[PDB]
């Protein structure tokens, strides 16, 4: 048997995707996320919505999906389908349409149990867009990523990179459109409405000025 | 075996999603629902439809999905996929398009058997919108949630919160659009057309005035 | 074991959805249908199409899905997923878009073997719409429901209610739009093009006049 | 056991849908197709596309799905789900959108092994539409059906009916639109680009003149 | 047992689609791709997007899906469903909508282990389109195909045909639209943002001038 097949069997034959992948239920599943703005397709002042094509990546730890490499031909990482493992329900609020995003089949996994998921997002979000300064307008729209259902005691959200490095990330931006990206400011806040439930969310402010 | 995996097996290995989860078929499955209006994307007088982005949550009791925590490391609640359990067919009438709503994967479950389902709704509804008072227009559109198929003797609908607390809920409203939300008035009515079938539905009147 | 679970097992453990549910293949599967027009969202003279939101219900007999109640705690009816049983391919011709219709999960079943399926239809149909009498225009569009593949010797279509009761059914119509519903006239005809195949279809004429 | 269930088991318990249904791999799977134009919803000169609602039927021989009727209560034909058998990938080129077409569940099968599949097509195709003779314009758009992947040595395409009978088929046309159908001319051609691969396709020219 | 069924069983009974199909994990899975532009449906300067209907084909080697023909009636190639085998996540960046593309069921396979996948692409891409030379405008938009997740050490991308033959391929172009295709220039580049990850992508520049 080839090493990859042996490892895949050893991992997925005694694993089920329903449960949150933690040995002890008393510990939360920390998720680190990152956002890169690839393009700004449309900014609609009439409908107060804008479309952003952003490259989204996140990683978390599956305490069940870990192995010792020397028993599997020193395999340090491998790829398996995303639908064969637990995936956090980290969803962006303020959304109005996300169906344009294709579902990526595979996710990378490392022998420590770390899972890396890279996916694109074609999300259109609803936010306030004023046209007061039309000729030299500057807009401030926000993306907030949250564990839709799980509370902070189950899922917590953190940054993959340092805040300043992602705040000034124009490395892959399509810098030839009507809008110019000034920054992507992150922000962490604990959101709570009921008297006992706290949810963790991460707000990304996309700052853009017309040209 | 970790506690979460043991509990998930104990629950789902002797459970099937087809049946209504009640020990005695003679008792109805009471469902408590709540509605929060997150935004009002569009109000179309031409087509007599308006779009509402509302946060919808509901809970019910699965008499099969219950356990004693002290046998499972004092696990009081856990999350499992929504497609692995019975889910009421509580659907909003007056709808014209609901495909924009993403399907949430997970639902919370408590050791009493209570199931909590949080999901977003991007529903567009058809209702009468008059433009008689255009400059200072005030509209009155309704959302009615009902068990589409099940009668009252199988599924009944109630309120999660007290009516007055939800009638004046503007806690998460996007209060920067063309429309302002004055209230969300609930109302319970038994709907019957045939001589023997009674269905339970809950009408939510979204009252909005232009600005 | 609770009665519902016992009945569900007894029914679905020795049943498969591929075959037409009849003890003798020589007899057709009679399907009784009913149509209620809930609203008329749009009437497009330019594209010669109109949209109708109609509440559709049908019932048929599954000779396999029958039981004696006294052996199952006097259970006279129960609900199971629609995708777990055979469902007739009764489709409306003249259609141009039906994707807006959500798939209802459950269907009611009675101990006689009768299956009841309630579903909504957001169908848009192509029909001739003349604008000759625009100010006082009256239109006559038709919906024809047929077993798309099965011939009359396999599937036959009948009316749930008497023709006159459904011809004057405005009980749930949204009577506040641009169009007023005058009647829904049914009609049964045997449709045949090849020299040996006869198909049963039921035409519903929706008569509407502008206002 | 009823005859239908016995036959369905006998057929599908020793059958798998992946392979091409032929006893000898050296022989091609001949597919006979037919096209009937039910309506011409739209002809867009701006985008150079037109929409045709056509009734499509095809049949082929499954050498595995055959039986002797006298062993199954003289059952000469039966219906089973289309997703439970092999189906040719006969796809129409020149297409721009086909998602509007619903997937038909069932297909008829005869004891000889013949499979009959009736399905509707809401395809919109891209073809050259000149507006030179606008007031009395006559257009000539084509539909070409081909085995997308399989070569002629695996799948071949033929006509169900004689060419002249289908060339003058206006039997179910919606003859009340802006366009009138003059004929549907078939044509068979072997398409080859690589030095060794030949693919069989059937071109249907829909001839229409404005009115 | 017929040869095709024997081969399909021998192949797929000891094979799983999760893993990358290589005997040794230390070697990358080289993928050869080709692009043919069938039509240019729309070029939108307003939204800075253009739609291209391109015929896409690719092939790779599955080291598990190989056999010796003389043991299977000299079967040199056969077709099996695409969802039953591993398929590279080679996705086109710069995309804005790909849902229009239908999923092809089957893929060809040869006894060496080579897998051939032919599929159509209805992708709309976002690229800079200037209207400076409107009457005689010439545009330069790019398609870049990459292994979305897998690095170069896992998936590498190459050309099926020689660059010059594909650079001057107008063999199936719909040469009757508003735009004329001057060439499809390929280009290979190793894309890297993190300090250790290198991804292989292939850029195809579609050069078009108005007429
Ligand atoms: C959830 O994650 C956030 C972000 O990682 C945590 O917030 C940080 O916590 C550390 C340590 O307590 C502080 O030094 C930082 O100042 C906090 N803020 C940020 C922006 O990093 C939070 O404590 C975590 N909560 C739980 C329950 O895990
Ligand atoms: C866009 O909005 C964000 C959030 O309100 C602004 O970020 C804050 O700016 C204030 C300015 O005094 C700072 O004190 C805060 O520390 C900032 N918060 C974060 C999380 O960075 C941002 O400045 C706004 N941009 C524009 C152009 O108005
Ligand atoms: C279905 O639920 C509704 C709402 O919970 C019930 O209506 C209430 O019933 C209680 C007790 O009979 C009354 O005190 C309330 O006045 C009723 N109305 C409201 C708005 O709460 C109804 O009785 C239930 N029916 C069944 C069959 O369970
Ligand atoms: C919107 O419509 C609802 C339902 O008709 C109104 O709610 C009712 O208002 C009347 C006013 O006399 C009260 O007597 C009822 O008790 C109310 N019913 C409920 C369930 O609250 C509402 O007032 C309307 N709003 C506007 C602005 O017209
Ligand atoms: C298919 O069903 C239709 C409608 O139920 C049948 O047509 C009726 O048949 C009865 C009895 O023969 C007549 O009294 C009615 O006048 C017919 N028309 C209507 C509108 O009810 C038809 O006979 C059935 N055919 C088969 C083969 O079952
Ligand atoms: C709409 O069309 C239907 C079908 O042509 C009409 O129904 C027929 O009307 C004629 C009038 O003489 C009657 O003789 C038939 O018996 C009717 N058939 C059925 C099945 O009811 C209907 O009258 C038309 N409505 C309008 C307003 O023109
Ligand atoms: C594929 O099918 C086509 C159409 O049935 C075949 O073309 C016909 O072949 C017959 C017999 O050789 C000729 O008499 C006809 O003139 C051909 N054309 C038409 C339009 O019928 C073709 O030979 C078949 N090829 C294979 C390899 O099966
Ligand atoms: C539409 O195009 C088709 C294909 O070019 C035409 O069909 C051909 O017409 C020529 C006319 O001389 C004949 O010689 C060919 O035999 C025809 N081929 C087939 C397969 O029938 C058709 O005439 C065109 N129609 C119009 C109105 O221009
Ligand atoms: C990935 O594939 C590319 C293209 O096949 C390789 O690039 C070529 O490599 C060969 C041999 O090293 C050179 O002769 C060519 O000049 C390279 N460029 C092109 C355009 O062919 C690349 O080496 C491969 N890398 C890996 C790690 O497999
Ligand atoms: C479209 O853009 C491509 C990429 O920039 C151009 O291709 C390059 O053209 C330059 C011209 O000096 C050559 O030196 C490069 O070798 C070309 N690269 C490749 C990969 O072919 C192309 O010329 C542009 N076309 C137009 C009409 O502007
Ligand atoms: C009173 C109240 C309680 C809870 C909430 S929150 C919420 C409500 C319904 C559906 C989903 C949610 N969310 C939970 C955490 N993740 C984001 C969405 C509100 C608004 C009011
Ligand atoms: C005469 C008559 C009988 C019953 C109804 S109800 C209905 C009808 C068809 C399809 C669905 C329903 N519903 C059932 C309960 N849940 C809401 C929808 C009518 C209108 C007339
Ligand atoms: C000559 C001829 C034969 C049969 C038909 S019918 C048809 C044709 C193709 C696809 C579907 C159908 N249908 C069968 C019964 N159910 C409605 C659709 C025609 C038009 C011509
Ligand atoms: C050089 C060349 C070779 C083959 C073709 S064909 C093709 C190409 C890519 C994807 C699909 C196809 N097809 C195969 C047969 N069925 C229709 C589509 C071309 C154009 C050029
Ligand atoms: C700092 C940085 C690191 C990596 C990338 S890449 C990327 C990021 C998120 C999601 C997907 C990707 N991709 C990986 C390779 N395949 C194409 C997409 C960037 C932009 C910045
Ligand atoms: C795995 O790595 C260890 C440490 O580098 C080495 O000793 C061993 O030989 C390696 N085994 C294989 C199969 O490469
Ligand atoms: C569970 O809770 C009970 C009551 O608080 C306690 O006595 C027991 O030690 C707990 N067990 C674990 C494993 O935490
Ligand atoms: C079922 O109904 C019969 C007849 O009414 C009655 O005699 C019997 O006691 C019932 N059984 C149960 C369990 O309700
Ligand atoms: C089947 O058909 C044959 C020939 O017509 C006949 O002899 C036989 O009795 C039939 N069997 C049944 C069960 O109808
Ligand atoms: C397979 O091919 C070999 C070599 O051409 C030949 O000797 C053998 O007879 C063939 N077998 C069959 C079954 O065709």
Distances (CA, A) of B78 to A29, A151, B13: 13, 11, 16
- CA–CA distance, D58 with D39 (Å, rounded to integer): 19
Q: How far apart are the first and last CA of chain D?
A: 60
With the most atoms of ligand 16 within 8 angstroms of its CB, the residue from A74, A75, A111 to mutate is A74
Give the Cα separation of C69 and D96 in Å (integer). 54
CATH fold group of domain B3-210: Acetylcholine Binding Protein; Chain: A, (2.70.170)
User: Tokens 């016992």 correspond to what residue?
Assistant: C6
B157 sits in the region (left: phi over 0; alpha: psi -120 to 50; else beta) called beta
What are the boundaries of each domain within chain C?
3-13+27-210
- Can you tell me the distance from the alpha carbon of B26 to that of B19, in angstroms, rounded to the nearest whole number? 14
Q: How many CB atoms lie within 10 A of CB B210?
A: 15
Q: How far is CA C44 from CA A97, A132, C131, C141, D38, in A?
A: 26, 38, 10, 12, 19
Pocket test for ligand 12, best of B147, B193, B194, B198 (most atoms within 8 A of CB): B193
Check the CA dihedral D140-D141-D145-D151 and report its sign.
Answer: positive
Q: What are the E-state strand segments in A155-198?
A: 155-159, 179-191
Nearest to A108 by CA among E196, D144, C188: E196
Q: Which residues contact E150 (CB under 8 A, 6 or more apart)?
A: A79, A106, E20, E29, E88, E89, E199
Q: Which helix (H) or strand (E) holds D10?
A: helix D3-12
Instruction: Report the C-alpha gap between D115 and D32 in whole angstroms.
Output: 11
D160 Cβ contact partners less than 8 Å away, ≥ 6 residues apart: D32, D33, D34, D57, D58, D59
Comparing CB atoms, the residue among D2, D4, D100 nearest residue C97 is D100
Q: In what order do the strands lie in the sheet with D138-147?
A: D90-92, D138-147, D199-210, D179-191
* Alpha-carbon separation of residue C87 from B152, C26, C99 (angstroms): 25, 19, 18
Q: What's E94's DSSP letter?
A: S
Please tell me the distance from the alpha carbon of residue D87 to that of residue D103, in angstroms, as a whole number: 13
C5 interfaces chain B, CB cutoff of 8 Å: yes
| Closest C-alpha among C56, C177, C58, C45 to residue C122 | C56
Atom number of ligand 6 nearest to Cα C186: 20
H/E stretch holding A6:
helix A3-12
Handedness of CA B18, B20, B23, B24 (dihedral sign): negative
- Restricting to C residues 141-170, those with a Cβ less than 8 Å away from any Cβ of D are 148-150, 154
Domain C3-13+27-210 = CATH 1.10.620.20: no
Residue whose C-alpha is closest to residue C10's, from D105, E181, B16: B16
Measured at the CA of D28, the angle between CA D24 and CA D30, to 5 degrees, comes to 125
Interior/surface letters A95-104, b for 16+ CB within 10 angstroms, e for the rest = bbbbebebeb
* B174 near A CB under 8 A: yes
Confirm or reject: Cβ of D74 under 6 Å from ligand 19: yes
Residue C134 contacts by C-beta under 8 Å, 6 or more apart in sequence? C210
The answer to whether residues A146 and A157 touch, using CB atoms and an 8 Å cutoff, is: yes
Strand ranges (E), chain D: 29-44, 49-61, 77-81, 90-92, 95-97, 106-110, 114-121, 124-126, 138-147, 155-159, 179-191, 199-210
Q: Are B177 and B170 spatial neighbours (Cβ–Cβ below 8 Å)?
A: no
Q: Do A84 and E149 touch (CB under 8 A)?
A: no
Contacts of A122 (CB under 8 A, 6+ apart): A51, A53, A98, A100, A101, E96, E97
Two tokens at C57?
A: 């219900």
Q: Are B158 and B187 in contact (CB under 8 A)?
A: no
Which two structure tokens, joined as six digits, stand for E107?
């893929």
- Cα C71 to ligand 18 centre (Å): 10
Residues near A9 by beta carbon (within 8 Å), at least 6 away in sequence: none
Alpha carbon separation from A8 to A75, C202, D154, E211 (Å, rounded): 11, 55, 35, 55
**Residue C79 has which token pair?**
């609900």
Q: Write out the two tokens for D203.
A: 């071109």
| Cα–Cα distance, D148 to D155 (Å, whole number) | 10
The terminus-to-terminus CA distance of chain A in angstroms comes to 60
Q: Which residues in chain D are closer than 8 Å to E15, comparing Cβ atoms?
A: none
Q: How many angstroms separate the CA atoms of B167 and B124, rounded?
A: 21
Enter the CATH code of domain A3-10+25-210: 2.70.170.10
CA distances from B202 to B126, B158, B184, B205 (A): 17, 8, 12, 10
Best CA proximity match to B43, nearest among B140, B174, B161, B144: B140
Q: Does D70 touch chain C (CB under 8 A)?
A: no
The residue behind tokens 């949250």 is A146
For B146, the 3-state DSSP assignment is strand
Which residue is listed with tokens 């003149």? Answer: D209
Residue B202 · residue B94 · CB < 8 Å: no
Among E21, E24, E25, the strongest candidate for a mutation testing the A interface, having the largest count of A CBs within 10 A, is E25
Return the SS3 of E91: strand
Determine, for residues C19 and D5 on separate chains, whether the beta-carbon distance falls below 8 Å: yes
Nearest to C79 by CA among B86, B198, B23: B86
Which residues sit opposite A206 in a β-bridge? A141, A184
Picking from C193, C87, C197, C187, the residue whose alpha carbon sits closest to that of residue C153 is C197
- Alpha carbon distance E134, A36 (integer Å): 33
User: D58: helix, coil or strand?
Assistant: strand
Residue nearest to atom 3 of ligand 9 (CA): E158
Q: Which residues contact E72 (CB under 8 A, 6 or more apart)?
A: E3, E6, E7, E10
Where residue A74 falls (left for φ over 0; alpha for ψ -120 to 50; beta otherwise) is left
Q: How far apart are CA D192 and CA D151, in angstroms?
A: 9
The sign of the CA dihedral C100, C103, C104, C107 is positive
Is the distance from the beta carbon of residue B202 to the nearest atom of ligand 3 less than 6 Å?
no
- Rounded alpha-carbon distances, angstroms, from residue E172 to D186, E162, E211: 20, 18, 19
Assess contact for E107 and E60: CB atoms under 8 A. Answer: no
CB A38 within 8 Å of CB A54: yes
Cα–Cα distance measured from residue C153 to residue C142, given in angstroms and rounded to the nearest whole number: 25
Rounded Cα distance, A164 and A162, in Å: 6
C-alpha of residue B8 to centroid of ligand 17, in Å: 20
**Is E194 touching ligand 15 by the criterion CB < 6 Å?**
yes
- 3-state SS class at C10: helix
User: Ligand 7: distance of its center to the CA of C34 in Å?
Assistant: 48
d(CA E100, CA A102): 12
Phi, then psi, of D4 in degrees rounded to 5: -60, -45
Q: Supply the DSSP string of A97-135, one letter for each residue.
A: E-TTSPPP-EEEEETTSEEEEEEEE--EEE-----TTGG
Shortest CA distance to E42 belongs to which of E32, E33, E53, E31? E53
The verdict on the CB of residue D127 being under 6 Å from ligand 8 is no
Task: Decide if E8 and D18 are in contact by the 8 Å CB cutoff.
Answer: yes
Residue C76 burial (C-beta neighbours within 10 Å; 0-12, 13-18, 19+): exposed
User: Are the beta carbons of E163 and E39 closer than 8 angstroms?
Assistant: no
How close are the terminal C-alpha atoms of chain B, in Å? Answer: 60
Q: For C211, what's the count of Cα atoms within 13 Å in the CB-facing half-sphere? A: 10
For residue E88, give every residue at least 6 positions away whose Cβ sits within 8 Å of its Cβ, in sequence order, or none: E29, E31, E58, E60, E147, E150, E155
- Please name which of C107, C91, C33 lies closest in space to residue B148, comparing C-alpha atoms: C107
Tell me the CA distances in angstroms from D191 to B101, D151, E203, one per residue in order.
44, 9, 29
Q: Is A71 helix (H, G, I), strand (E, B) or coil?
A: helix
CB E167 within 8 A of CB E186: yes
Q: Give how far the C-alpha of residue C21 lies from the chain's centroid of Cα atoms, to the nearest Å.
A: 18
Q: C residues 121-140 near D, CB within 8 Å? A: 126, 128
Angle at the Cα of D144 from the Cα atoms of D138 and D150, rounded to 5 degrees: 175
How far, in Å, CA of D57 to CA of D79, rounded?
15
8 Å CB contact between C141 and C125: yes
Q: Tell me the C-alpha to C-alpha distance, in Å, between residue A116 and each of A33, A44, D7, E117.
A: 10, 34, 49, 28
Sign of the CA dihedral with E16 first, then E104, E3, and D71 last = positive
Reduce the secondary structure of B7-67 to three states and give it as a string: HHHHHHCCCCCCCCCCCCCCCCEEEEEEEEEEEEEEEECCCCEEEEEEEEEEEEECCCCCC
CB of C207 within 8 A of CB of C137?
no
Distance A69 CA to ligand 16 centre (A): 9
CA of E63: how far to CAs of A10, D164, E14, E73, in Å? Answer: 21, 51, 13, 21
Which 8-state DSSP code applies to residue E141? E
Alpha-carbon dihedral B173, B174, B178, B181, rounded to 10 degrees: 0
Q: Are B208 and B125 in contact (CB under 8 A)?
A: no
- What kind of fold does domain E3-12+20-210 have according to CATH? Acetylcholine Binding Protein; Chain: A, (2.70.170)
The closest-lying atom of ligand 19 relative to the alpha carbon of residue D69 is 1
Q: Report how far residue D6's alpha carbon sits from residue D69's, in angstroms, rounded to the nearest whole number.
A: 12
Question: Which tokens is B211 given?
Answer: 């600005």
Residue D103: CB partners within 8 Å, gap ≥ 6?
D82, D119
Cα–Cα distance measured from residue E117 to residue E139, given in angstroms and rounded to the nearest whole number: 30
DSSP state of E208: E
**What whole-number distance in Å separates Cα of residue A179 and Cα of residue A211?**
6
CA distance D53 to D51: 7
Contact residues for C62 (Cβ-Cβ < 8 A; gap 6+): C21, C85, C86, C109, C113, C114, C115
The H or E element spanning position B186 is: strand B179-191
| The CA-based dihedral angle spanning residues A101, A102, A106, A107, taken in that order and rounded to the nearest 10 degrees | 0
Ligand 9 pocket: which of E34, E154, E156, E166 to mutate (most atoms within 8 A of CB): E156
**Residue A103 CA, ligand 14 centroid: distance in Å:** 26
> Is residue B3 less than 8 Å (CB to CB) from chain A?
yes
The whole-angstrom separation of Cα D63 and Cα D85 is 12
CA–centroid distance, residue E186 to ligand 10 (Å)? 10
Question: Which two tokens mark D90?
Answer: 């006969």
Please name the helix (run of DSSP H) or strand (run of DSSP E) that holds residue C44, with its range, or none: strand C29-44
Are E174 and D126 a contacting pair at CB < 8 A?
yes
- Which residues are C106's β-sheet partners? C81
Residue nearest to atom 1 of ligand 9 (CA): E156
Number of neighbours of residue E190 by Cβ within 10 angstroms: 11
Pocket around ligand 2 at a 6 A CB cut-off: A 138, 140, 185, 187, 205, 207
Instruction: Note whether C48 contacts D: Cβ–Cβ < 8 A.
Output: yes
All residues at 6 or more sequence positions from D191 whose CB lies less than 8 Å from its CB, including other chains: D146, D198, D199, D200, D201
Query: How far apart, in Å, do the first and last CA atoms of chain E sit?
Result: 60
- Cα distance between residue E117 and residue E112, in whole Å: 15
Tokens of A6: 């042996």
Provide the b/e sequence for A59-88 (b: ≥16 CB within 10 Å).
bbbbebbebeeeebeebebbbbebebbbbb
Contact, E152 vs E146, CB < 8 A?
no
Q: Which atom of ligand 20 is nearest to the CA of E70?
A: 1
CB-CB contact of B60 with B89 (8 Å): no
**Strands (DSSP E) along A166-198, which ranges?**
179-191
């Amino acid at each position: 048997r080839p090493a990859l097949l042996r490892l895949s069997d050893y991992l997925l034959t005694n694993y089920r995707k329903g449960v949150r992948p933690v040995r002890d239920w008393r510990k939360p599943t920390t998720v680190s996320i990152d956002v890169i703005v690839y393009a700004i397709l449309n900014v609609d002042e009439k409908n107060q919505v804008l479309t952003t094509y952003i490259w989204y990546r996140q990683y978390w730890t599956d305490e069940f999906l870990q192995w010792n490499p020397e028993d599997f031909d020193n395999i340090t990482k491998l790829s398996i389908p995303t639908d064969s493992i637990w995936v956090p329900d980290i969803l962006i609020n303020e959304f109005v349409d996300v169906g344009k995003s294709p579902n990526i089949p595979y996710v990378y996994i490392r022998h420590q149990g770390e899972v890396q998921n890279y996916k694109p997002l074609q999300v259109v979000t609803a936010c306030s867009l004023d046209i007061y300064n039309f000729p030299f307008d500057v807009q401030n729209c926000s993306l907030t990523f949250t564990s839709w259902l799980h509370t902070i005691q189950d899922i917590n959200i953190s940054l993959w990179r340092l805040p300043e490095k992602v705040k000034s990330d124009r490395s892959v931006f399509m810098n030839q459109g009507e809008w110019e990206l000034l920054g992507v400011l992150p922000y962490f806040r604990e959101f709570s409405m009921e008297s006992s439930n706290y949810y963790a969310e991460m707000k990304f402010y996309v700052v853009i000025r017309r040209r």
